[PDB]
Amino acid sequence: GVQVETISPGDGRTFPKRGQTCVVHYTGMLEDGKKFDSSRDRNKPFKFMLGKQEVIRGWEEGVAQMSVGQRAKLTISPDYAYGATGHPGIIPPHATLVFDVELLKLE
Amino acid sequence: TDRVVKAVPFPPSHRLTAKEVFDGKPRVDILKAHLMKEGRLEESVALRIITEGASILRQEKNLLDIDAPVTVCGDIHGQFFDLMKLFEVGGSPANTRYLFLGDYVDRGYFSIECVLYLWALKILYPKTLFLLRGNHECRHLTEYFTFKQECKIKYSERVYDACMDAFDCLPLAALMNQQFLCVHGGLSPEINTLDDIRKLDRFKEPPAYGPMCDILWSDPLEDFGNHFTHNTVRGCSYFYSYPAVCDFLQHNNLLSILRAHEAQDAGYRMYRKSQTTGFPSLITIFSAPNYLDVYNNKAAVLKYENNVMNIRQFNCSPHPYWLPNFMDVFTWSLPFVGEKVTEMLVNVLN
Amino acid sequence: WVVGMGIVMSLIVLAIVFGNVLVITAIAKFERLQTVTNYFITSLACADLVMGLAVVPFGAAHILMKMWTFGNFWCEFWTSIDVLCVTASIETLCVIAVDRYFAITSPFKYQSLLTKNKARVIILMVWIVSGLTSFLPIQMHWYRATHQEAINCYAEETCCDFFTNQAYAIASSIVSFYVPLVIMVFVYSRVFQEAKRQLDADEIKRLGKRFKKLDLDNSGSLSVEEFMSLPELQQNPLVQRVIDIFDTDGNGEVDFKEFIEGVSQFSVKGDKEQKLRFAFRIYDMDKDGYISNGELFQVLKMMVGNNLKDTQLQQIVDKTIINADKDGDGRISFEEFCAVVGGLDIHKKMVVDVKFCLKEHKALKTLGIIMGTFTLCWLPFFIVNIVHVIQDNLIRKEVYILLNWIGYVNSGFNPLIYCRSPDFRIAFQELL
Ligand SMILES: C=CC[C@@H]1/C=C(\C)C[C@H](C)C[C@H](OC)[C@H]2O[C@@](O)(C(=O)C(=O)N3CCCC[C@H]3C(=O)O[C@H](/C(C)=C/[C@@H]3CC[C@@H](O)[C@H](OC)C3)[C@H](C)[C@@H](O)CC1=O)[C@H](C)C[C@@H]2OC
Ligand SMILES: CC(C)NC[C@H](O)COc1cccc2[nH]c3ccccc3c12
Numbered sequence A: 001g002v003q004v005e006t007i008s009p010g011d012g013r014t015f016p017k018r019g020q021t022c023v024v025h026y027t028g029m030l031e032d033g034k035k036f037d038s039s040r041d042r043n044k045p046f047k048f049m050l051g052k053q054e055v056i057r058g059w060e061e062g063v064a065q066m067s068v069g070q071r072a073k074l075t076i077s078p079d080y081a082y083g084a085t086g087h088p089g090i091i092p093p094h095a096t097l098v099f100d101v102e103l104l105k106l107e
Numbered sequence B: 001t002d003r004v005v006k007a008v009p010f011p012p013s014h015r016l017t018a019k020e021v022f023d024g025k026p027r028v029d030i031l032k033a034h035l036m037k038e039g040r041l042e043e044s045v046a047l048r049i050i051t052e053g054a055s056i057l058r059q060e061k062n063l064l065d066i067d068a069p070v071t072v073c074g075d076i077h078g079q080f081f082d083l084m085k086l087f088e089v090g091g092s093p094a095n096t097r098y099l100f101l102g103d104y105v106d107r108g109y110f111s112i113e114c115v116l117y118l119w120a121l122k123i124l125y126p127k128t129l130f131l132l133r134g135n136h137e138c139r140h141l142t143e144y145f146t147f148k149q150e151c152k153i154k155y156s157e158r159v160y161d162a163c164m165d166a167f168d169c170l171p172l173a174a175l176m177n178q179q180f181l182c183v184h185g186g187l188s189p190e191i192n193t194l195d196d197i198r199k200l201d202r203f204k205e206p207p208a209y210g211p212m213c214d215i216l217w218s219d220p221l222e223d224f225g226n227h228f229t230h231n232t233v234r235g236c237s238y239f240y241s242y243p244a245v246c247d248f249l250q251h252n253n254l255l256s257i258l259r260a261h262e263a264q265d266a267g268y269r270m271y272r273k274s275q276t277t278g279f280p281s282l283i284t285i286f287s288a289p290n291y292l293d294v295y296n297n298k299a300a301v302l303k304y305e306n307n308v309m310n311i312r313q314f315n316c317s318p319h320p321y322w323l324p325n326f327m328d329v330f331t332w333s334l335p336f337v338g339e340k341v342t343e344m345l346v347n348v349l350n
Numbered sequence C: 001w002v003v004g005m006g007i008v009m010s011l012i013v014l015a016i017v018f019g020n021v022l023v024i025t026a027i028a029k030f031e032r033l034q035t036v037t038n039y040f041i042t043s044l045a046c047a048d049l050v051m052g053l054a055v056v057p058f059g060a061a062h063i064l065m066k067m068w069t070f071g072n073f074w075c076e077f078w079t080s081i082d083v084l085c086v087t088a089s090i091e092t093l094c095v096i097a098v099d100r101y102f103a104i105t106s107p108f109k110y111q112s113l114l115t116k117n118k119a120r121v122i123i124l125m126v127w128i129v130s131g132l133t134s135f136l137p138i139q140m141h142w143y144r145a146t147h148q149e150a151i152n153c154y155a156e157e158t159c160c161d162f163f164t165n166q167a168y169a170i171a172s173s174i175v176s177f178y179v180p181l182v183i184m185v186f187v188y189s190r191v192f193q194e195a196k197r198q199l200d201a202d203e204i205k206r207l208g209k210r211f212k213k214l215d216l217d218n219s220g221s222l223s224v225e226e227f228m229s230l231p232e233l234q235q236n237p238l239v240q241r242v243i244d245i246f247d248t249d250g251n252g253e254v255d256f257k258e259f260i261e262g263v264s265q266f267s268v269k270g271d272k273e274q275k276l277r278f279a280f281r282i283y284d285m286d287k288d289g290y291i292s293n294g295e296l297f298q299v300l301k302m303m304v305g306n307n308l309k310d311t312q313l314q315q316i317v318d319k320t321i322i323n324a325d326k327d328g329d330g331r332i333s334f335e336e337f338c339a340v341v342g343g344l345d346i347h348k349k350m351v352v353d354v355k356f357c358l359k360e361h362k363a364l365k366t367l368g369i370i371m372g373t374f375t376l377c378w379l380p381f382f383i384v385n386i387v388h389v390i391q392d393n394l395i396r397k398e399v400y401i402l403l404n405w406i407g408y409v410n411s412g413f414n415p416l417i418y419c420r421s422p423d424f425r426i427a428f429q430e431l432l
Helices: A057-063 B029-035 B043-058 B080-090 B111-124 B139-144 B148-154 B157-167 B211-215 B242-251 B329-333 B335-349 C002-026 C036-065 C073-105 C107-113 C116-139 C148-154 C166-194 C204-214 C240-246 C256-263 C272-283 C293-304 C310-324 C334-340 C364-389 C399-412 C414-418 C422-431
Strands: A004-008 A021-025 A046-049 A071-076 A097-099 A102-106 B070-073 B098-100 B129-131 B180-182 B256-259 B268-270 B282-285 B299-304 B309-314
Touching: A057 A071, A071 A102, B029 B111, B043 B111, B043 B157, B070 B080, B080 B111, B080 B299, B080 B309, B111 B129, B111 B148, B111 B157, B148 B157, B242 B256, B282 B299, B329 B335, B329 C293, B329 C310, B329 C334, B335 C204, B335 C240, B335 C272, C002 C036, C002 C399, C002 C414, C002 C422, C036 C073, C036 C116, C036 C399, C036 C414, C073 C107, C073 C116, C073 C166, C073 C364, C073 C399, C116 C166, C166 C364, C204 C256, C240 C256, C240 C272, C272 C293, C272 C334, C293 C310, C310 C334, C364 C399, C364 C414, C399 C414
Parallel strands: B070 B098, B098 B129, B180 B256, B256 B282
Antiparallel strands: A004 A071, A021 A046, A021 A102, A071 A097, B070 B299, B268 B282, B299 B309
């Protein structure tokens, strides 16, 4: 499952599309708050395009529920997370993910 | 080829086999200029430096005695280059004395380098620099955080064990000028007078609760203006109120207490002014600019000279890049190699 | 004249020694070639080098000087060494043939039951059998003849003309070059009559239909544009690289000879080593066997795009390479790669449904050429020897010696054939 809990809303006149590319600054975490990665450690935003399966499905079906210029929280369940195997290095097996993504730009 | 972009300096690939870093009193300037280029040291040399630091720190009293003209600095949390900028800002250790308070290891990718440099300069300078124990020098927290992986990737786990057995002996009270008391965390209701922090056993891992587990984990009230009330932020120690600190200062003749937990945008904070004397009773100092690369906080460093308290601000400095959890790019990119190759081939075949 | 003949002999022996030394060195330390067949090949190579060093200069001197004044007991040593070299070059080829026959019927069984220990055991066993059959018959003097010239040459220290007894000649010919020859021919014929059936398993036919459907120009080749004709594949970052591993001979396109050989690398029947080697070969931008800083930087730069600063990517690459250098060269080999990666369980992620394994059909052609050339060159000597031993006694006193030198050139030919294999080329270029 994916849950979106808005902290700061943005303008609702624009929404991301499937063919659009979103540029965001994100600070991922885990279930217990142990931060694992961020997009502010490096001074460069992270870009990804919907439709194709390069991000986990949780991101794909959660960011679509957001709006432009809205900073929110996500709690990605293990179902839509890296699965039973888990990404080697960071994410352990059966690990609920917590994210703090903030959309910045479209295309 | 050999190097696609040549602007980035190449990290030196040779470790130092105690030939140059020791003259025994060690050499500081070459150690600084070697570790500032992401160099490295041999395992035996690092173990020797840490062991000598532990040996020279074990003889230290629980409550240090420090004279008047001093410089006080907050926690670091592994930022090596910010530490070097701090040394540059505060002057050479030869002409001034320091009082380091906070933790040195967790939440940073240059922790082993920072602890090595600090303890080497401690070996060279034994009376003009005093280190204090923090809240992040335990087995539990460091195993939880990214210090164990630092030691494993850079050195062997024996370095980790030696560094922990060396943290085991740090002092924790550090009285200053018999007028100011400097503890890393805060007061505890269990501790009544200064003698209580003059006799307790400090050579052990902190327990679940007690005097030493509360001195490093306590925290002043965060919403003043709304004694032993429990902590929700940490969950392991208590608060203390303005009447509590007032009673402690009245029982034992002092003026103020200093601490280095609360990361602050301003870098320094003076809590409620003492109406009896006019000077603030609790001081919070943070000396790690750009904490976690997201806080964007200007650090602060205090100086006490000629019976004058003053605060100097502190800026940031660039540092190199590391991958989270120290992945090597093969482990970083291989799951995105296999998936893409298999996707293309399944697409072509069917 | 004598100068020309001496020059020819010197060039022949020098070329034999140089080629065989190169072949032996290529499998000595650069041990990417770690196949039991390669151990049999290096046994054959050291055997023919021994033959060269022992007999070729001595035979050349005997021919040129018109007299062999080295000694008398050295005559028996020389003849026995020659016999040993020929017999040990036969039976090793027969062993290779039977090995390759059992390595096609049951690939997993062959790779499980047979290891280096059995390889060395059977190599030593065949060498001992050949040594017995070469030493013992000569030393018991069964080659004695009733001819007066033979008796005179036996009690003489200069002639050393190999005179053969009829029974001994027949026995030697039937136990050294007639039984193992028919056995190797029969076994390799069976291999080519069951290794041409596995390519008719109704699966490779389906992949052939797919290959015909995919190709547009109907020229029998697959280019980069034709792989990029698929609309759902134009956005794969590392698509060019997989084509470059497929494209083995560098012609610029993929053909059905290498299409199905490379796709079979991603099969359930395959092992960890093949898929891990493919993962390695993704990085090599020159196929030379080493990953430099530029290669490992550009491979990651085509993937990460512009999500990291150039300086940051270069720095993490530098740290990775320094943490990977176990010798100080500045590049990562496949052993250093397997020290770094392995345990991530990547062999379980590169999986395809295909059920055909063709990882042993790669060395049949060179081995077949070796067997065919060797038999073709060394047969005339034995057939003319058989003609001579019969009472026919045709006038062939000169060509009977020229066929021996033909056999020597044949024994030297092997590295020339082995140089054709692409994997042996880059190993040779390491020394050059
Ligand atoms: C060098 C090329 C490799 C390529 C590297 C980059 C593009 C650089 C880019 C900044 C990635 C970061 O590198 C610092 C880093 O981002 C994380 O920290 C992270 O916060 C994370 O979880 N993100 C990133 C933000 C989108 C969601 C999620 C993700 O889906 O990321 C994707 C992801 C991991 C795909 C998995 C792969 C494994 C499959 O099993 C799984 O299938 C379900 C899908 C991204 C798009 C991949 O392209 C990552 C790569 O491997 C990962 C914890 C690990 C990841 O580095 C690996
Ligand atoms: C004239 C001699 C010195 N030349 C021998 C040839 O090298 C190859 O001859 C043989 C190789 C292997 C087995 C053999 N058995 C024989 C029996 C009689 C003659 C030659 C051979 C022979």
